[PDB]
Symmetry: C5
Subunit: 66 residues, 5 copies
């Protein structure tokens, strides 16, 4: 069912997970649930235009695990 | 068939697949069917200057399947 | 241990290691100890916006070894 | 042989191969025959500042084969 | 010895080797001898922001060989 999430659902996930500043980049890049499940390391660290510290933890604990 | 597509045909393919906004990047880069069949992941995700969410779906669900 | 460090501690480490100017990029990118332990080569060399000469030493001598 | 070409010879080759506009990037980047023989895929697709459609053909049909 | 070289020594090397214009990029990035010995292909071809033809030859004949 995460594969069905809208862009706004993804934004809400990253907000509640502790990354409200970076959640807006998921909106900017139109990352819905389908796209979220396709993201790889470089997509998080370079493709969102977010700060690197948060990006590393977003990837490690919330995207690599998917 | 894809090997026979002009740039115009490529734009039509992505428009009909639900990516009318990103289809313009194939116009900008003048990617016809022969070049489309040569694209790899990074070419789509970084070489087109399109939003990452759509780019991931464009590559994985539409280009890899040609 | 380094993985427990605050961003402030990371900045202090690099300041005292010989990189007072590059330390500000660890502040800007919000690199805490958890992030520091997740960094790979390209993250240091391309993700911090610092001079490449110092970046190569920062990675080789201080981050790769973590 | 191509490895012996001057920059101007490289420009001439790409001009006569169907890429008169992209040939100027070989002049700008000062790609002589020795350089041409050292190019890898990413160098063609991201190092010349040319349209990606033509770049994919330049690599696949003309540089990869050297 | 080259491990002890300053940035100035690196600039002299690349100038005398036939790359006076690209030597400036080693100044910009403050690549001394210790850092020169750590450079990999992408560090030269992208990390210095120099022209690609010279970069390819610099890497092949002067940096990869180290």
């Amino acid at each position: 069912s995460p594969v069905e999430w809208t862009v706004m659902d993804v934004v809400e996930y990253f907000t509640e997970a502790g990354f409200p500043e970076q959640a807006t980049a998921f909106q900017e890049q139109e990352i819905d649930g389908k796209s979220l499940l396709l993201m790889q390391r470089t997509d998080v660290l370079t493709g969102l235009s977010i700060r690197l510290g948060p990006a590393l933890k977003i990837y490690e604990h919330h995207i690599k695990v998917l």
